[PDB]
Amino acid sequence: SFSGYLKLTDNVYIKNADIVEEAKKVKPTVVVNAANVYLKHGGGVAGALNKATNNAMQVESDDYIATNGPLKVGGSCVLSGHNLAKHCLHVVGPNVNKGEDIQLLKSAYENFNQHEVLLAPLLSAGIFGADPIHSLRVCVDTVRTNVYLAVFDKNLYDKLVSSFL
Ligand SMILES: Cc1nc(C)n(CCC(=O)O)n1
Structure with a gap:
């Protein structure tokens, strides 16, 4: 089970x-x-999780995109967790480096509320x-499930810990 986490709020925990x-x-x-729309x-x-699945995550993801098309920025999909988890919830947060709306970060975190623990x-x-300080603030103010x-x-x-309000 989850160990060595610092409790930030009733439902948000953090670990290095x-x-x-x-x-x-x-x-x-x-x-x-931390997925992108494709x-x-x-x-x-994403690269690290995919490499840990021996590219099985990417093969599954390519079939998902071929069938469904891209996700929305702020959206998600549930796919296999392969050797890492029961499920992988691929969530698309806005990529500021691609000029995406930072306001979509709250919508991206709302996807976590469909899962009791993540x-x-x-x-x-x-x-x-x-x-990342802003991301943690949006996380604690949006996610109600155990993250x-x-x-x-x-x-x-x-x-993040020392500046957490
Ligand atoms: C500077 C930095 N390096 C990484 C990776 N990030 C993303 C947040 C994290 O550490 O999990 N930010």
Whole structure:
């Protein structure tokens, strides 16, 4: 089960951890992927989760896109968690580096409310270009279900905890 997390609120927990290593250890019902609309898992969390599935996540995702078309920014889909989780909830936070509306971050976090408990990264953080402090604020103010946040970067984890209101 989830261990070593700092409790931020009644339902939001945080840990300085590699989400792939966390997923392999916990085997959560849901691991959230920081997806893009095409489910092209190239880098960041998506690239790391996909590599851990030996590319099975990308093969499954390509079939999903062939059938359904792209997701919306702020949207999600539930696919297999492969060797990492029962399910992977692919959530598209806005990518500020692609000029996407940062206001869609709340809509992206609303997807988490469809799942009782999730292992997740901070949406739109990292290579998506948004401020991770703002992402954590939107997370705690939007998500009502139990969310265990894995923050890879140690220095960022310390900054997130020390500045948390
Ligand atoms: C600076 C940085 N490096 C990464 C990865 N990020 C995204 C948030 C995290 O650490 O999980 N932000």
